Design an enzyme around this catalytic site. Structure first.
Site, PDB file in Angstrom:
ATOM      1  N   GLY A  12       0.646  -1.128   0.383  1.00  0.00           N
ATOM      2  CA  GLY A  12       0.246  -0.201   0.134  1.00  0.00           C
ATOM      3  C   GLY A  12       0.592   1.273   0.261  1.00  0.00           C
ATOM      4  N   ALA A  15       2.796   4.396  -3.350  1.00  0.00           N
ATOM      5  CA  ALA A  15       2.634   3.742  -4.715  1.00  0.00           C
ATOM      6  C   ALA A  15       1.714   2.708  -3.998  1.00  0.00           C
ATOM      7  CB  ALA A  15       4.156   3.295  -4.313  1.00  0.00           C
ATOM      8  N   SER A  39       0.052  -5.254   5.013  1.00  0.00           N
ATOM      9  CA  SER A  39       0.076  -5.149   6.218  1.00  0.00           C
ATOM     10  C   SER A  39       0.088  -4.320   7.255  1.00  0.00           C
ATOM     11  CB  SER A  39       0.717  -6.175   7.198  1.00  0.00           C
ATOM     12  OG  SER A  39       0.536  -5.585   8.341  1.00  0.00           O
ATOM     13  N   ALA A  44       6.371  17.417   0.271  1.00  0.00           N
ATOM     14  CA  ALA A  44       6.068  17.791  -1.186  1.00  0.00           C
ATOM     15  C   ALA A  44       6.085  16.926  -2.762  1.00  0.00           C
ATOM     16  CB  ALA A  44       6.931  19.079  -1.492  1.00  0.00           C
ATOM     17  N   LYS A  72       1.491  24.815  -2.585  1.00  0.00           N
ATOM     18  CA  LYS A  72       3.640  25.364  -2.617  1.00  0.00           C
ATOM     19  C   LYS A  72       3.149  25.430  -3.603  1.00  0.00           C
ATOM     20  CE  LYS A  72       7.617  22.109  -3.389  1.00  0.00           C
ATOM     21  NZ  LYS A  72       7.904  21.629  -4.680  1.00  0.00           N
ATOM     22  N   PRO A  90      10.353  28.356  -8.454  1.00  0.00           N
ATOM     23  CA  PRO A  90       8.874  28.292  -8.621  1.00  0.00           C
ATOM     24  C   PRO A  90       7.734  27.185  -9.922  1.00  0.00           C
ATOM     25  CG  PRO A  90       9.870  30.926 -10.411  1.00  0.00           C
ATOM     26  CD  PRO A  90      10.735  29.640  -9.923  1.00  0.00           C
ATOM     27  N   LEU A 329       9.015   3.330  -5.049  1.00  0.00           N
ATOM     28  CA  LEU A 329      10.718   2.977  -4.508  1.00  0.00           C
ATOM     29  C   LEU A 329      11.098   1.840  -4.742  1.00  0.00           C
ATOM     30  CD1 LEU A 329      10.794   4.151  -0.331  1.00  0.00           C
ATOM     31  CD2 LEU A 329      11.923   5.015  -2.690  1.00  0.00           C
ATOM     32  N   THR A 340      10.435  14.482  -6.143  1.00  0.00           N
ATOM     33  CA  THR A 340      10.135  14.169  -7.398  1.00  0.00           C
ATOM     34  C   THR A 340       9.749  12.750  -6.826  1.00  0.00           C
ATOM     35  OG1 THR A 340      12.321  13.631  -7.415  1.00  0.00           O
ATOM     36  CG2 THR A 340      11.648  15.588  -8.967  1.00  0.00           C
ATOM     37  N   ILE A 342       6.151  11.159  -5.462  1.00  0.00           N
ATOM     38  CA  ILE A 342       5.025  11.157  -5.564  1.00  0.00           C
ATOM     39  C   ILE A 342       5.111  11.679  -7.847  1.00  0.00           C
ATOM     40  CG2 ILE A 342       3.252  11.961  -5.501  1.00  0.00           C
ATOM     41  CD1 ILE A 342       3.760  12.786  -2.608  1.00  0.00           C
TER      42      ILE A 342
END
Lengths: 491, 492
Positions: A12, A15, A39, A44, A72, A90, A329, A340, A342
């Site tokens: 979960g 990701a 189980s 940002a 943000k 920006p 990951l 970066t 997400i």
């Protein structure tokens, strides 16, 4: 029928539940079983995330309320060029392009002739971030000068919970269970099923590995290797700790990134709490030295003691093997210097949908997915490298080395064409567009020798007044815009 | 001041005078000397309307001056066998839904028995087949009404129009043969041209528009040639201008007709037309070639046919030292997809975006050379595909094209298309996904499986959404004026 009948998402978190929610919406009324197996902290993002949940039917206000989020407008880099240095990256362009020529060329001409106005005076996004202001950008905006975008600081855990509830309402199964083993088909080597602790089997046609850094299916089961990138990026560890806001502390609409003696500190503001951390090189810092930099400079009262996290920069050698696709990951890791993590989940998901397979798992589909994913990781790596490569800090060996370290040839070419001509080398699969490269070049004080010579045709008195009008429109628009706090009070 | 002070363009024609006009406008009030030194019907893509757009010129004035007509796309005849017929337009097909490309929904329905061609969902293509023309809407209701258009024009007249434009902005012109190119002694950079009368023409920056021979980039500077005859069979061509017969309305498309060992072109101007045959001399004699061409012209021939040698390929580096090569001096691909003028345009845009100073910094050359090379390869591969997918059984030429090896870049494209109905995207493509789709569909090559999010849709619901689209286009076409009406508004 060669049709995929079932999808099993292993793990979960962000990701796993981003993948489940996205596939639930995309295949809403199709006969596709989707199941997650799992189980029983501030993060940002970039603006793509608002489109991600946009496509699910969700609103900015509802997602922000549910995730303790704040606005943000960009990232603020402090002390990368020496004590007191200060610039904002920006989400937006600078100035207004003219006759097909990029604004920055006209700015450089005028800078050559004596004008000292920062390039940032011509970005509304950056000016709004520096002013502690926030407002929604106009759609159908008056002109190019009023275009900016925005993203979220949010609780990742809460974000995961919100998407879980979304996915389950569309018919995604959930199984709370530890996995004992992965079972492979002996003819093909493809993944047949997961074996749970209680001995139940979970079968599937397509598996997505969201198990995290360990890589339970893509790595341990299927033997896919890891391209290590520690040689390009010095830092190899991190400490993170949540802080509680002190009374009368208005959270800022930007992420703070503060360079320290042998790495850098992050500061991610939520509504009542904040994410804090230090990324650093253990070869230059002990654990106690690291905590000595981090703990006196948090955005608030620490909620716990700091946890150490191992960093191992690099990418999974192929993100898709057989009938396993790796998302998050499990597919690789780059430090959160430019927010970066997400974003790489989002691009992975879009790509899975664009190349969604059948049960024959045609090799060209895997090859294209693997090729896009690899190049995109490399393009983010190079943007991250640049930040270290151009630092101007004299105070430690860490920073000299970063300045003299070799860098990939892809980045050498970019740096070389920028300093020669003020133009951008463009590869495929760039997450960061030319304006973001510009922000870093200008933030570290690296400017071309020669601007575009069609620009010298323009009259210095005429130019000077067009620029002062822009500079003023932004300053005055910022001045009359409400503070960040007012938008948050309306959530 | 390292500033370029002067530019010398070696050769006129389209390459020379497009370059002069573009640089005159871009550097209009700068102290930059520009000089040109010098002594047939053609097609284009829509970029050319933007090119002269940027100069301050209008479509009607340029069209009047160049005997031009409208071009909605190219019509491919007999590439799949006798009677085969498809149009490559400037536009997309149908309406994309939920991020999924239209062609997937079309394939699902095609699987379930519907026989409507993919072209029924392109307004551009429908207008070309209907002999119709109208300006596209600036702010169109939706994707279904979006198409673009280009010109069939006299290249010589186009060159003359740009010459008068360039001269009014201060471009010098020197009518003279060049005896020699003089190179400077430390650097080997180009110092000056020596004319037949002994005058010298000095410059800081030279543009070679001398044509196929490559007077500066090739002969003077020694830059080599990457030959591509191995990938492309055809190695010769005949061209001949024809005079229209009375009551012959020029069509708003180029005709490309496959023959026994190559192909014929047909480029309509207002009262005249360009004609030609591209072919393999190893399969055809000169008389056999003329036997295919001369009975099937768009009119009465104005002269006898001239032969032209074709040598497909690219200059190894398009920019060396202080010489940039523009047009034929930088390479050659046959006009199957109307790309000659387009390659001049891209060269010019690139020169402006990377305009140098007198130090001629190596990274600028490297980027220019890299972009140019990749772009040529991307056009080559699109051209190759047309031969690779042919379905003609009648000669050895055509079997061989179907079984010939092709670059790996194209193998990968064809493989992902048949596996999944998706497009491999490289940098510097002149031709976007909808153009690849037009060729895949024109030669009848379709994927085994479409995108499975599409099978969520009901076959009765889908069938009627598609019939509505199909009708919106057919009815819009039906009520649009003929090509001839737009041309009468340029003419007597």
């Amino acid at each position: 029928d060669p049709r995929i009948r079932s999808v099993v998402i292993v793990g979960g978190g962000t990701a796993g539940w981003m993948t489940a929610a996205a596939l639930v919406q995309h295949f809403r009324t199709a006969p596709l079983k989707i199941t997650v197996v799992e189980s029983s902290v501030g993060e940002a993002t970039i603006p793509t995330i608002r489109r991600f949940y946009g496509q699910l039917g969700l609103r900015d206000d509802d997602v922000m309320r549910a995730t303790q989020a704040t606005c943000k407008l960009g990232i603020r880099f402090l002390d990368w060029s020496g004590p007191g240095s200060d610039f904002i990256h920006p989400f937006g362009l600078y100035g207004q392009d003219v006759k097909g020529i990029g604004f920055h060329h006209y700015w450089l001409k005028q800078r050559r002739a004596g004008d000292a106005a920062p390039l940032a005076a011509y970005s509304l996004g950056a000016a709004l971030a520096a002013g502690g202001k926030f407002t929604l950008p106009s759609p159908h905006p008056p002109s190019q000068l009023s275009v900016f975008d925005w993203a979220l600081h949010l609780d990742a855990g809460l974000f995961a919970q919100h998407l879980r509830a979304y996915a389950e309402a569309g018919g995604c199964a959930r199984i709370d269970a530890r996995i004992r083993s992965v079972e492979l088909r002996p003819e093909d080597g493809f993944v047949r099923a997961l074996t749970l602790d209680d001995g139940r089997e979970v079968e599937g046609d397509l598996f997505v590995d969201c198990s995290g850094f360990k890589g339970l299916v893509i790595g341990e089961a299927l033997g896919v290797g890891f391209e290590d990138w520690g040689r390009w990026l010095p830092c190899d560890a991190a400490y993170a700790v949540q802080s509680e806001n002190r009374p009368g502390d208005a959270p800022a609409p930007f992420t703070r990134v503060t360079a320290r003696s042998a790495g850098w500190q992050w500061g991610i503001p939520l509504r009542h709490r904040a994410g804090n951390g230090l990324v650093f090189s253990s070869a230059h810092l002990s654990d106690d030295q690291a905590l000595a930099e981090l703990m006196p400079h948090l955005l608030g009262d620490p909620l716990t003691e700091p946890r150490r996290i191992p960093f191992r920069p690099g990418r999974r050698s192929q993100a898709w093997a057989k009938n396993c696709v790796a998302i998050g990951l499990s597919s690789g890791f780059l430090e959160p210097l430019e927010s970066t993590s997400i974003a790489l989940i989002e691009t992975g998901i879009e790509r899975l949908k664009a190349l969604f397979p059948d049960r024959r798992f045609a090799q060209p589909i895997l090859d294209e997915f693997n090729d896009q994913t690899a190049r995109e990781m490399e393009r983010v790596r190079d943007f991250i490298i640049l930040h270290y490569k151009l630092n101007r800090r004299t105070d430690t060996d860490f920073w000299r080395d970063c300045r003299e370290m070799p860098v990939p040839e892809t980045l050498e070419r970019k740096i070389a064409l920028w300093t020669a001509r003020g133009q951008f080398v463009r590869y495929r699969w760039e997450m960061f567009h030319p304006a973001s490269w510009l922000a870093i070049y200008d933030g570290f004080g690296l400017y071309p020798d020669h601007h575009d010579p069609a620009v010298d045709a323009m009259d210095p008195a005429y130019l000077a007044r067009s620029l002062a009008e822009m500079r003023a429109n932004i300053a005055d628009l910022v001045a009359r815009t409400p503070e960040h706090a007012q938008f948050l009070a309306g959530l």
